[PDB]
Design an enzyme around this catalytic site. Structure first.
Site, mmCIF file in Angstrom:
data_model
loop_
_atom_site.group_PDB
_atom_site.id
_atom_site.type_symbol
_atom_site.label_atom_id
_atom_site.label_comp_id
_atom_site.label_asym_id
_atom_site.label_seq_id
_atom_site.Cartn_x
_atom_site.Cartn_y
_atom_site.Cartn_z
ATOM 1 N N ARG A 1 59.107 68.262 39.151
ATOM 2 C CA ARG A 1 58.058 68.874 39.924
ATOM 3 C C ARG A 1 57.368 69.945 39.062
ATOM 4 N NH1 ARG A 1 58.056 71.274 45.653
ATOM 5 N NH2 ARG A 1 56.045 71.684 44.600
ATOM 6 N N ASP B 1 63.316 73.004 45.943
ATOM 7 C CA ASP B 1 63.062 74.264 45.196
ATOM 8 C C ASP B 1 64.382 74.998 44.970
ATOM 9 O OD1 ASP B 1 60.304 73.798 45.483
ATOM 10 O OD2 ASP B 1 60.099 75.331 47.030
ATOM 11 N N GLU C 1 50.339 81.992 44.783
ATOM 12 C CA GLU C 1 50.280 81.277 43.490
ATOM 13 C C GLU C 1 48.785 81.266 43.092
ATOM 14 O OE1 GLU C 1 51.998 77.703 45.173
ATOM 15 O OE2 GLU C 1 53.839 78.113 44.033
ATOM 16 N N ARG D 1 46.446 80.501 46.584
ATOM 17 C CA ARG D 1 46.968 79.957 47.789
ATOM 18 C C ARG D 1 47.119 81.107 48.755
ATOM 19 N NH1 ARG D 1 53.059 76.998 47.795
ATOM 20 N NH2 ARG D 1 53.340 76.935 50.040
ATOM 21 N N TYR E 1 51.138 69.773 43.737
ATOM 22 C CA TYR E 1 50.837 70.700 42.644
ATOM 23 C C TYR E 1 50.163 69.949 41.491
ATOM 24 C CZ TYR E 1 53.800 74.647 44.354
ATOM 25 O OH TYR E 1 54.333 75.683 45.079
#
Ligand SMILES: CC(=O)N[C@H]1[C@H]([C@H](O)[C@H](O)CO)O[C@@](O)(C(=O)O)C[C@@H]1O
Length: 655
Positions: free
Chosen positions: A208, A233, A499, A515, A610
């Site tokens: 990722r 995550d 972010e 974001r 992403y």
């Protein structure tokens, strides 16, 4: 392995083709393999590539098919009406839709194996799913199969799930072919867009958080999160891997591990996707996550990353401690020794561990990779392994005891840190990590990085690194070419996972695009090289779910329609992480942006999470992106889903 039927260049717009004559009485065992090379003319609606059914009235639920959804899911059904058995096997984000204005050619396959009682599905060189099912059905198990159709399923004398496109080639075999044969048969141009692949040199099945950067020499550099315990995550075991291209992205190096701990080894795990397993996690493992790259003016490259000690989630990290202690003006990393409640120790000059109570050095020291020595010899711990029969256990291998590990004699404060490494040879080799000083304060944890790139503000030479805290932006910066670091903390209107990425509009003038938690992309403007920031504004043409997604935006070196340009990548959909778009923004004399062009990356219901843009040496644009919805609990732990694509500016003008 010989086909019982082969057809070619079959163009369909919903109506299908009857192949009953050619296929009735070919499937003696009941097992089968079907390999389909196709492209879709319209992606809307549930579409079957082929259907083998009982077509008589009353038997609507007696069929086998392979289907495609408008979100790129590939699946199969095998059903029998009278027994009310209903098998469905699938994986999200299995195929491509469109690419640069043309339908993409995919190659998919299904294998039905009655001895193993499994169904397998393949797309574009990857076995996307394999499932043993109790109520297994093959063609013979379903009562009264009398109709075999390309591009539909004949239910009660009517065509259902009508396919719209061209079946370039389709092959039916009356047996289950082996994994490697079918992978090879499904390999095509789509397969070549992976830089990082499951179980490559990195040993990871999952990735990722892609980042691309172009260096001054014309090398194009990539980093990524190698996430070993599925795509979570946290908690997870995560390394940063890298790979580069010296030919404008046509070819890439085999991936290297660049930031890694070895408390767990870098080995492939088959992470469960079922609802009852997908929440399983690797518990006790030290992690690097979320990389940021910048090239300094002197051509040295920096890479930053978040550092998480073993057993520390973003959510459970103490927020009221930096992990550092101030002694006589200097900042020093604290350590707790096993069996103590307080943090009685610090790492000072040469990595020597000091007892703060006596202010005297001990015999312990910490090396440049955070390894613990005693009298100049390394202490060791047993490495861990993971097994699914989930169990985590010590494997007999000794690795250096490290301050970030669960089994360490001396341990850091269980909180998040930021580290950075530097390269003098354009990313072929790297320095040991430097932990960032407590720039937010002694009684606050480090910020979290906004993945992607940093920038050099041209007029001041200031290095800017984007980060965030949950409630504020933290723009980490250096005014002495990276010798020392400070931070501008900017209060935000709400708890944004902010972010961010930066662009320069003109000398001294920068914008941070980020974001939010409100559905929009925000941008803050600074007219003094990052020192002070305007109130937020919002892009009016992007509309996302409240949770948001990371974005990418870059400066482009060449004029477009005679104007300086920036280039933005983001999803753009309130239904999920979907509908990727690339926007070209042209800067006006007054420093507002004319958002003149956009290009949709694939269809609107396909996954796009992403992303990262870079300008290639030849002035094309490189894009790497998570081609799936990385928020959805339905799309976790998927392999081979982060492709790289190159665009010409003329491609990005279209849509
Ligand atoms: C692949 C798939 O999802 N198939 C399902 C379809 C679709 O949802 C269609 O939209 C409606 O035909 O719906 C069913 O009720 C049906 O028609 O028997 C169940 C079936 O499992």
């Amino acid at each position: 392995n010989t086909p019982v039927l082969e057809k070619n260049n079959v163009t369909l717009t919903g109506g299908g083709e009857n192949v009953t004559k050619e296929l009735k009485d070919k499937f003696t065992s009941g097992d089968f393999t079907v390999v389909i090379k196709y492209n879709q003319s319209s992606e809307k609606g549930l579409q079957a590539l082929f259907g083998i059914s009982n077509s008589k009235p009353g038997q609507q639920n007696s069929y086998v098919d392979v289907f495609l959804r408008d979100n790129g899911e590939l699946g199969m059904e095998a059903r029998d009406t009278s027994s009310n058995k209903n098998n469905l096997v699938s994986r999200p984000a299995s195929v491509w839709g469109k690419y640069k204005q043309e339908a993409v050619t995919n190659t998919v396959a299904v294998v039905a194996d009655s001895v193993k009682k499994t169904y397998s599905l393949y797309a574009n060189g990857t076995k996307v799913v394999e499932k043993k099912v109790d109520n297994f059905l093959n063609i013979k198990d379903i009562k009264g199969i009398d109709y075999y159709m390309l591009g539909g399923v004949k239910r009660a004398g009517k065509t259902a799930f009508g396919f719209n496109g061209t079946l370039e080639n389709i092959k039916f075999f009356n047996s289950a072919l082996d994994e490697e044969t079918v992978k090879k048969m499904t390999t095509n141009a789509v397969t070549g867009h992976l830089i990082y692949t499951a179980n490559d040199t990195t040993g990871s099945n999952y990735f990722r958080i892609p980042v691309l950067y172009t260096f001054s020499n014309g090398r194009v550099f990539s980093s990524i999160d190698a996430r070993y315990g599925g795509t979570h995550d946290f908690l997870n075991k995560i390394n940063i891997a890298t790979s580069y291209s010296d030919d404008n992205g046509k070819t890439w190096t085999k991936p290297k591990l660049t930031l890694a701990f070895d408390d767990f080894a870098p080995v492939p795990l088959e992470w469960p996707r079922e609802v009852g397993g997908r929440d399983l996690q690797i518990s006790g493992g030290a992690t690097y996550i979320d990389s940021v790259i910048v090239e300094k003016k002197n051509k040295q490259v920096l890479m930053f990353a978040d550092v998480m000690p073993a057993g520390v989630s973003f959510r459970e990290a103490t927020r009221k401690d930096s992990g550092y202690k101030q002694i006589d003006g200097n900042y020093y990393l604290k350590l707790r020794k096993q069996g103590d409640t307080d943090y009685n120790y610090t790492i000072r000059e040469n990595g020597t561990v000091y007892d703060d109570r006596t202010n005297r050095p001990t015999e312990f020291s910490v090396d440049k990779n955070f390894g613990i020595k005693q009298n100049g010899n390394y202490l060791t711990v047993e490495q861990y392994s993971v097994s699914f029969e989930k169990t985590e256990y010590r494997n007999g291998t000794k690795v250096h005891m490290n301050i970030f590990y669960k089994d360490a004699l001396f341990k850091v404060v269980p909180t998040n840190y930021i580290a950075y490494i530097s390269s003098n040879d354009h990313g072929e080799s790297w320095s040991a990590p430097t932990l960032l000083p407590p720039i937010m304060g002694l009684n606050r944890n480090a910020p979290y990085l906004g993945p992607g790139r940093g920038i050099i503000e041209s007029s001041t030479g200031r290095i800017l690194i984007p980060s965030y805290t949950g409630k504020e932006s933290a723009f980490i910066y250096s005014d002495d070419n990276g010798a020392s670091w400070k931070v501008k903390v900017v209060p935000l209107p709400s708890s944004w996972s902010a972010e961010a990425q930066f662009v320069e509009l003109s000398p001294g003038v920068i914008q941070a695009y980020m974001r939010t938690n409100n559905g929009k992309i925000a941008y803050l403007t600074s007219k003094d090289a990052g020192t002070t920031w305007s109130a937020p504004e919002y892009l009016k043409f992007v509309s996302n779910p409240s949770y948001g997604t990371q974005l990418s935006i870059i400066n482009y070196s060449q004029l477009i329609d005679g104007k300086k340009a920036v280039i933005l990548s983001t999803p753009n959909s309130t239904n999920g992480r979907k509908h990727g778009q690339i926007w070209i923004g042209l800067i006006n004399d007054d420093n507002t942006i004319d958002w003149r062009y956009h290009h949709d990356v694939d269809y609107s219901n396909y996954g796009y999470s992403y992303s990262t843009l870079t300008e290639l040496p030849n002035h094309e644009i490189g894009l790497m992106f998570e081609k799936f919805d990385s928020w959805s609990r339905n799309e976790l732990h998927m392999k081979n889903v982060v492709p790289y694509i190159t665009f010409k500016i003329e491609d990005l003008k279209k849509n």
